[PDB]
Design a protein around this ligand. Structure first.
Ligand SMILES: *[C@@H]1O[C@H](CO)[C@@H](O[C@@H]2O[C@H](CO)[C@@H](O[C@@H]3O[C@H](CO[C@H]4O[C@H](CO[C@H]5O[C@H](CO)[C@@H](O)[C@H](O)[C@@H]5O)[C@@H](O)[C@H](O[C@H]5O[C@H](CO)[C@@H](O)[C@H](O)[C@@H]5O)[C@@H]4O)[C@@H](O)[C@H](O[C@H]4O[C@H](CO)[C@@H](O)[C@H](O)[C@@H]4O[C@H]4O[C@H](CO)[C@@H](O)[C@H](O)[C@@H]4O[C@H]4O[C@H](CO)[C@@H](O)[C@H](O)[C@@H]4O)[C@@H]3O)[C@H](O)[C@H]2NC(C)=O)[C@H](O)[C@H]1NC(C)=O
Ligand SMILES: *[C@@H]1O[C@H](CO)[C@@H](O[C@@H]2O[C@H](CO)[C@@H](O[C@@H]3O[C@H](CO[C@H]4O[C@H](CO)[C@@H](O)[C@H](O[C@H]5O[C@H](CO)[C@@H](O)[C@H](O)[C@@H]5O)[C@@H]4O)[C@@H](O)[C@H](O[C@H]4O[C@H](CO)[C@@H](O)[C@H](O)[C@@H]4O)[C@@H]3O)[C@H](O)[C@H]2NC(C)=O)[C@H](O)[C@H]1NC(C)=O
Ligand SMILES: *[C@@H]1O[C@H](CO)[C@@H](O[C@@H]2O[C@H](CO)[C@@H](O[C@@H]3O[C@H](CO[C@H]4O[C@H](CO)[C@@H](O)[C@H](O[C@H]5O[C@H](CO)[C@@H](O)[C@H](O)[C@@H]5O)[C@@H]4O)[C@@H](O)[C@H](O[C@H]4O[C@H](CO)[C@@H](O)[C@H](O)[C@@H]4O)[C@@H]3O)[C@H](O)[C@H]2NC(C)=O)[C@H](O)[C@H]1NC(C)=O
Ligand SMILES: CCCCCCCC(=O)OC[C@H](COP(=O)(O)O[C@@H]1[C@H](O)[C@H](O)[C@@H](OP(=O)(O)O)[C@H](OP(=O)(O)O)[C@H]1O)OC(=O)CCCCCCC
Ligand SMILES: CCCCCCCC(=O)OC[C@H](COP(=O)(O)O[C@@H]1[C@H](O)[C@H](O)[C@@H](OP(=O)(O)O)[C@H](OP(=O)(O)O)[C@H]1O)OC(=O)CCCCCCC
Ligand SMILES: *[C@@H]1O[C@H](CO)[C@@H](O)[C@H](O)[C@H]1NC(C)=O
Ligand SMILES: [Cl-]
Ligand SMILES: [Cl-]
Ligand SMILES: [Cl-]
Lengths: 330, 343, 334, 334, 345
């Protein structure tokens, strides 16, 4: 009884023709369930995402009159009926799933409504404004639309529950915390025509736990250690010189991780500004002793250590006051 | 001859778009897993590899046959023309259905219309890791699977035997470098989605991270560097170059060790247990150099005591530091290893 | 209904083996490109990856329909039943058509027979890179479009919207480069076998210098200046000057080793290599300077010109020569 | 003389059933196998797998494919393999594999007049072998390749190495960047289960890691740093700056050696032989620096209330104990 | 048009794509020509290289002779798969790509006399085994072999279209090499005995010579200057015990840094190369310089150094004076022997 219904629906059917091709635009209602948001790759400016993509539209050619209300079908009928050519506009690489069978579902109601769902894994490009790193926040988008059908042919619209997520604790976000998400609608003009574009924006804020312990605190300690020489006597040339140049070597070693997981962007991130200023302070402390040693011994001038005992901590605390307020509250 | 004839008639009037017993009963699938090799686990990707012989059994009443034989083996061309469950792994990322040298699949039909469906797969599933306890972390990596298109009212999954006896892991195949497979927990359930309710089968593999490598590579070198910094408390206060070089080079050594240890861990942005231990070790080595700067501030005469005038007494800061620093560091180790190893 | 019968008639008798105007004039194929993104500019592999919207325009009278005022956009699978140009990319290493949720391909018929064939393609395109001026280098990476089997007597290539056929270049943001300009070139390669059409899209990529100033050039300059501090230190402070001299050499070594691991592996001498070696030499001579200072005093002082003379002469020459080295280096590369 | 062949080849396939094995109701079909290893590459300790490329031949006699009148062995187009029965041979420890397909699929079908079928395949297989790297780098690995039928049991299909122990060639030509193939072995056993015995063929290799890199890069510099730490024992007890700098820099150098080796070497996160040696040398440099602290305190802390004795005993115990550690180390692992 | 479409619709009547041309009558001779569009990067880590070529194969099939106005056809890729073509494969190829963007980059032309010209565009990744003992002063000959997979020399043979030297042509800008210099190629043909028979193999060896200037600037010169710096300490007065001690150890630490840095560039092989021997000898020279001062320090008596205004003072150590000559001379001799062992080859 169901075999006859399926056979009759495809009799005299052309999957190459849009439903109501010369009547009105085909309205497609889209629903998305985000299984997981994969790691953000700042080097490649992209993120991974696994979703359940559901599209709903009406196809008058698939109306069937019977006691059955809906035909719950597997993926073998996807290639027999017309399917929207929905593609993700910022997907660098995306793929469906085929284990153990194609991860696709097709349900057809008696009034011609079709529900088409498939599981997708998408690597979507995301342009990261890496200023203020590692105190940076991003809204990585996910845009999809039809490929060949303009706004006069295919129109997309979100459902009452557009995007659903899971528990957010099974996700693979290493560097970021998921803040929130938003969905928008827009029409984009191209040479082929005007297209309806659906967009989802995932707002991500970078977690700062690693950078404080690994980078900020050690760099602060090295700068404080370089201030020790201001209390060592000026006659202890081997002690102050070795302390000054070894903190420079330590600061150079620490400076090698300021730009490690991020691309070779040529603007100064917040992490690089802090490391560079720390390198200047330890550089200036060693130069401070060199100036003091030359003028005192090798011919106010002789009170440089007393001035540097207060000026260096004051200027470093003043720099930290400006630095942390600007990137956290400004 | 008879074997050929039954195969020709086996799919006459057969619609593979309809699940068996549609409109009469829910399709019952008895699953069965044989883990050949619980493959490598990637901390940097939060995913694990597993090699299994995934089995599924159900009844297709339309495929009953009469003949001298009792079991029919179907080739891959005919197996693709027969309805099979649309089983998928919920947490799988990119699995492989092996095709060498032929499709590693086998469909067998019993006389009463019972189908046994076996396939060899390399499932690359996901495992959500919370590495706050790293390297003393334990994880329960799941393997959830079920039907994609059929809700619980159409296709139902169950384990063929008792759930603990349905996932059989190979004794030889463990393939874990930094984990120990304590055991697996097997259970089923129902999940809720916008498209209905689905039967889900879960299998959790419990992994305990091995710590011996991290003790010798990170913890022991960091502990000994903290000891060397406190060794400076016994050097005489008049050896300013020696005590200065001792302090800064230990800080440089700690910095060298801190970077190396962090480079081994996956790039998470939250502080782990190893991060706190190194941070505290960084504080002790920092404080030892600060301690000498205070001792040197109250040193009066440059010369030290000779073999046989006034001479500097032993610093009270030095004498108390010889006790406070080792005792505080020993206290910190007692709290640290009790908090993370007793969980 | 009426649209259904017309398409069935158009595709009935259509021979995919024959080009439009098979026995007559060459079919004139017009090409537009909408570049979605450029990424993974590789110096080691000498290639780059771009994603683009590739549109081909040509007229086939066999696909003309009347009585329908619409531009018939069809399912992508109809493209396999129609003749399309045999367009390939010459410098393409590896390319694919995106296929999620379906193959990113469009066919749009027009009443006059015009066919619009669109493809969303990600292509890794080879381009030889002269990196002897790295990081102050400028690269010109191209994309070559050709017909595999048809000569200029059977197919013609032009840029539809000549100077505006390629769009989206001005919106591309490369972390390491800036696109100075791009050019569209149309020509025929004249061979004895025959003349073949070719379309060439080329960009001029200019690497950004701000990154290397922060990571490679500024640290090296500061360490070189630090090595000059010993020239103001007293000659009798052997431990201080030796420690300062040899720690700057180790510090310079750490910088070079760090760059050799973070920068791409380009195993030949570049502009950055010339600078790092020059800085390593300067700190090498600063430590070598004190050896002369120490040996003149403690080696030839007893036998018995001025130990202070070598230091004072070094306080002027070393800063002067490093600026002289810098002045020549930057003029030669900028 | 091709019309006879064309008739014969078409006559063989007319009436052929691909779903039935040779001698469907009779004795098991014996399949002989030969392997010609083209190369082995990427023997990875981290992934615990190796990649080998081989020519995998299978021989069996099909009475239905026997022909008479042609004295030649009919080598047919490789696409005829889709029309014949072939064994369902797979590899148990295969993680991923593929038949090469340029310019065509790299397979061969060659019939013989008596009915023997030669079915060849050029396969690149990533196979998984568990590696015990506790003795690394002084470790010998044993990586195998298990060959089995997926569905048939020993009553329907039987495996054997064709020709004997010379069924696998090309092993002597295998060159690995960091291993030496000591030998290979061929095993033919039936795996007996409750349901029924299954034919299996096993090919195993013994890999021996080369030690030349580790001697000069890991062991030799570590030995030199340890010996250099003993120099402080011959320095005066009151030379605090010299002995502390010598002691603490050798500790830093040992850390630099150990941490960088951790970066370069493959990430195997359990205790290996190389870890023990580096840790042992780090204890000695720690003790040599700690020895001066005892000497310095005894002279300066307990002095006013002999430090020549501690130094002279350290000049003997440290060289002797480090010699003993190497003797114990190089005997346990070698 | 109708004449042209009638020829294509009747060429394959009674054509058996399972049988090679001249099966049982003669030997199928295939003329082969390679145009190398680019010689891609060479991966010393994977011991492999990529090569973009236009692969041309010309043979004859008497079953495909046609009569008409044109003297050459052009088959679409659907009919190109219905006609027997040589099963040419690359013996050392690892993962080769047949481009099909935007359409299959193939072309099959049939001439009136039944001669087929088959051209395809391929990106072949072939394995190039290397002996890196002389690294970074090593030269290699990366091969590119191909032949019939299934047909022995008694059924299918391969010959170059023209003289072998002129059959493999490299474009003017086909050298996409950062580390090597392509010195040219040698083209040859031969026979191989297999377990399945004797097969014709067409061989092309590309001769590559590694560039040396990068390793001089990055590795050799810093190592030579580090050793020179270690011997500079011999000219410091023996009384500068802390100075000559930090000079020794920091030079050792510097040599440790350079040794690891230079080893990163070379692919991970477990045998010693020419760069390892140079660094190891440089390691020993720096190690021995610190041992030299340890002996000198053992025989120093007075803690004070010579004063300019001049008591009894220490003499210049005979070990120091002898090491001021022996160490520079021994390293010069080593450099003379080292740079003549590998460069002279
Ligand atoms: C340049 O050349 C390359 C190489 O040739 C081209 O790459 C090829 O591209 C084409 C077009 O996209 C592919 O064909 C379709 O593939 C899909 C997907 O399955 C394939 O791909 C999966 C994923 O591979 C990924 O990576 C590869 C690269 O490595 C990439 O190419 C690919 O796009 C993707 O990114 C594989 O996992 C999958 O293998 C799995 O499944 C196999 C069985 O399918 C199994 O044998 C394997 O072991 C493994 O488990 C497979 O390789 C196919 O779904 C699709 O087949 C459907 O559509 C065609 C359309 O003509 C139709 O003929 C088929 O019958 C089938 O449609 C039926 O099934 C549908 C799904 O159930 C259903 O929806 C339909 O309604 C229909 O059902 C009807 O028939 C069935 C019986 O068939 C009946 O039961 C029903 O009742 C009903 O009547 C195509 O095969 C090639 O796979 C791909 N090849 C390669 C090597 O990459 C590239 O495109 C070229 N580029 C250019 C510019 O020309
Ligand atoms: C990256 O690097 C590539 C490679 O170098 C650059 O590509 C080159 O760009 C230049 C500048 O745009 C191109 O030259 C131009 O070519 C066009 C087209 O010429 C073709 O068609 C003509 C049709 O009339 C025909 O006459 C030409 O034949 C002549 O020239 C060829 C050589 O190109 C020669 O072999 C023949 O014998 C003829 O002499 C050819 O078939 C041409 O129209 C341009 O002319 C301009 O300049 C002339 C100067 O006298 C002027 O008279 C014209 O009015 C006009 O202003 C010009 O010659 C070159 O062809 C490109 N080469 C390739 C391989 O693509 C690319 O520009 C670089 N990118 C960047 C961003 O810099
Ligand atoms: C890497 O590591 C693997 C695993 O250890 C190595 O593989 C092993 O190699 C050895 C050889 O070095 C193999 O031993 C030989 O095995 C054959 C085959 O045995 C099978 O068939 C026999 C009948 O032909 C049968 O008797 C065997 O049954 C035995 O094992 C079962 C196990 O359940 C047991 O129940 C039985 O009681 C038997 O003990 C089995 O089915 C065998 O024919 C050889 O016999 C030789 O030696 C015996 C004396 O021991 C002698 O009597 C014979 O005449 C003959 O000389 C021999 O046992 C071993 O089987 C391989 N194992 C596996 C799992 O592959 C591999 O060699 C390593 N690599 C390298 C490079 O070394
Ligand atoms: C991190 C430490 C920070 C300390 C910050 C605070 C530092 C601070 O306040 O130092 C002062 C004092 C110095 O102690 P210390 O023994 O080093 O210095 C002696 C002290 O100054 C005597 O008073 C001097 O004698 P006199 O009267 O002139 O004859 C004596 O001279 P000499 O006879 O030898 O020539 C000096 O050597 O230390 C404490 O009181 C230790 C408190 C507990 C410290 C507990 C620390 C754990
Ligand atoms: C790694 C090399 C190890 C070499 C180990 C070599 C060990 C070895 O043999 O040492 C002995 C001697 C040390 O000589 P050196 O110059 O170091 O020291 C002098 C020596 O001790 C005299 O005996 C002292 O004279 P005196 O009697 O008190 O008046 C003199 O006192 P003063 O005038 O300063 O007050 C000291 O300076 O060396 C050689 O003769 C060089 C041999 C060739 C060495 C060739 C080295 C290349
Ligand atoms: C977003 O989703 C909600 C919920 O489905 C829907 O009501 C709304 O129209 C969508 N679009 C915008 C722009 O909010
Ligand atoms: Cl992330
Ligand atoms: Cl693991
Ligand atoms: Cl290269």
């Amino acid at each position: 009884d169901v075999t006859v219904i399926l056979n009759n629906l495809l009799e005299g059917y052309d999957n190459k023709l849009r439903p109501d091709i010369g009547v009105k635009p085909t309205l497609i209602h889209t629903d998305m369930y985000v299984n997981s948001i994969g790691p953000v790759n700042a080097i490649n400016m992209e993120y991974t995402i696994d979703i359940f993509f559901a599209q709903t539209w009406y196809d008058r050619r698939l109306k069937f009159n019977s006691t059955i209300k809906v035909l719950r079908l597997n993926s073998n009928m996807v290639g027999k009926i017309w399917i929207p050519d929905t593609f993700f506009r910022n997907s660098k690489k995306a793929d469906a799933h085929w284990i153990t069978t194609p991860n696709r579902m097709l349900r057809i109601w008696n009034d011609g409504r079709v529900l088409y769902t498939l599981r997708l894994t998408i690597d979507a490009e995301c342009q990261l404004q890496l200023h203020n790193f590692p105190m940076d926040e991003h809204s990585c988008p996910l845009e999809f639309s039809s490929y060949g059908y303009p706004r006069e042919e295919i129109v997309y619209q979100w459902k009452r529950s557009s995007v659903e997520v899971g528990d957010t604790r099974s996700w693979r976000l290493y560097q970021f915390s998921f803040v929130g998400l938003r969905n928008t609608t827009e029409v984009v003009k191209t040479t082929s025509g005007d297209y309806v574009v659906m967009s989802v924006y995932f707002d991500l804020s970078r977690r700062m736990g690693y950078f404080t312990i690994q980078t900020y605190i050690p760099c602060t300690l090295i700068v404080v250690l370089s201030w020790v020489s201001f209390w060592i006597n000026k006659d202890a040339v081997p002690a102050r010189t070795s302390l000054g140049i070894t903190t420079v070597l330590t600061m150079t070693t620490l400076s090698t991780i300021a730009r490690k997981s991020l691309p070779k962007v040529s603007y100064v991130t917040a992490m690089d500004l802090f490391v560079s200023v720390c390198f200047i302070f330890v550089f200036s402390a060693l130069v401070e002793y060199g100036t003091l040693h030359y003028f005192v011994s090798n011919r106010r001038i002789a009170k440089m250590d007393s001035y540097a005992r207060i000026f260096f901590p004051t200027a470093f605390c003043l720099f930290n006051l400006v630095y942390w307020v600007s990137y956290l509250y400004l | 001859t008879v074997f050929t004839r039954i195969l020709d008639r086996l799919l006459d009037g057969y619609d593979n778009r309809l699940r068996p017993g549609l409109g009469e009963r829910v399709t019952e699938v008895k699953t069965d897993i044989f883990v050949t090799s619980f493959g490598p686990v990637s901390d940097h990707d939060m995913e694990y590899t597993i090699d299994v012989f995934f089995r599924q059994s159900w009844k297709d009443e339309r495929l009953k046959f009469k003949g001298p034989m009792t079991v029919l083996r179907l080739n891959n061309l005919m197996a693709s023309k027969i309805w099979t469950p649309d089983t998928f792994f919920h947490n799988g990322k990119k699995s492989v259905a092996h095709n060498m040298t032929m499709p590693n699949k086998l469909l067998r039909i019993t006389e009463d219309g019972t189908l046994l469906y076996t396939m060899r797969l390399t499932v690359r599933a996901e495992c959500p890791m919370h590495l706050e306890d790293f390297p003393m972390d334990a994880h329960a990596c799941p393997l959830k699977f079920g039907s994609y298109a059929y809700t619980r009212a159409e296709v139902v999954y169950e384990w063929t035997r008792e759930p603990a006896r349905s996932v059989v892991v190979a004794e030889d195949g463990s393939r874990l470098n930094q984990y120990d497979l304590l055991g697996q927990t097997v259970d089923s359930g129902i999940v809720q989605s916008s498209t209905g309710e689905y039967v889900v089968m879960t299998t959790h593999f419990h992994l305990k991270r091995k710590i011996g490598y991290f003790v010798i590579q990170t913890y022991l070198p960091c502990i000994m560097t903290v000891i060397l910094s406190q060794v400076s408390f016994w050097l005489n206060r008049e050896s300013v170059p020696a005590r200065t070089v001792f302090g800064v080079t230990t800080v440089l050594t700690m910095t060298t060790l801190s970077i190396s240890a962090r480079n081994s861990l996956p790039k998470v942005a939250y502080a782990t247990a190893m991060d706190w231990f190194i941070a505290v070790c960084y504080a002790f080595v920092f404080s030892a150099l600060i301690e000498f700067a205070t001792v040197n501030y109250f040193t009066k005469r440059g010369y030290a005591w000779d073999g046989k005038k006034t001479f500097n007494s032993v610093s009270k800061i030095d004498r108390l530091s010889r006790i406070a620093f080792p005792l505080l560091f020993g206290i910190f180790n007692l709290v640290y290893w009790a908090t993370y190893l007793n969980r | 209904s009426f649209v259904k019968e017309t398409v069935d008639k158009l595709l009935k008798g259509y021979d995919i083996r024959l080009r439009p105007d098979f026995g007559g004039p060459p079919v004139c194929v017009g090409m537009n490109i909408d570049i979605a993104s450029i990424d993974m500019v590789s110096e080691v592999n000498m290639d780059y990856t771009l994603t683009m919207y590739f549109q081909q325009y040509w007229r086939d009278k066999r696909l003309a329909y009347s009585g329908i005022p619409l531009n018939l956009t069809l399912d992508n699978r109809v493209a396999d039943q129609l003749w399309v140009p045999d367009t390939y990319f010459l410098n393409d290493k590896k390319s694919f058509v995106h296929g999620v949720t379906v193959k990113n391909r469009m066919i749009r018929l027009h009443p006059d027979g015009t066919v619009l064939y669109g493809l969303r393609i990600t292509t890794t395109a080879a381009c030889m890179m002269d990196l002897r001026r790295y990081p102050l280098d400028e690269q010109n990476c191209t994309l070559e479009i050709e017909s595999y089997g048809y000569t200029t007597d059977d197919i013609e290539f032009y840029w539809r919207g000549g100077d505006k056929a390629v769009t989206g270049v001005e919106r591309i943001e490369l972390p390491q480069f800036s696109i100075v300009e791009h050019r569209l070139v149309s020509r025929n390669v004249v061979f004895a076998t025959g003349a073949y059409p070719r379309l060439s899209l080329s960009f001029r990529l200019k690497r950004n210098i701000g990154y290397f100033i922060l990571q490679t050039y500024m640290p090296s300059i500061l360490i070189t200046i630090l090595s000059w501090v010993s020239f103001w230190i007293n000659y009798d402070a052997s431990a201080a000057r030796v420690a300062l001299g040899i720690t700057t050499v180790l510090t310079m070594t750490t910088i070079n080793t760090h760059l050799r691991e973070t920068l791409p592996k380009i195993p030949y001498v570049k502009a950055i290599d010339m600078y790092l070696m020059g800085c390593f030499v300067f700190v090498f001579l600063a430590l070598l300077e004190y050896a002369f200072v120490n040996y003149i005093f403690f080696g030839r002082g007893p036998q018995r010109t001025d130990v202070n003379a070598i230091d004072r002469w070094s306080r002027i020459v070393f800063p002067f020569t490093f600026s002289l080295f810098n002045l020549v280096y930057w003029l030669y590369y900028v």
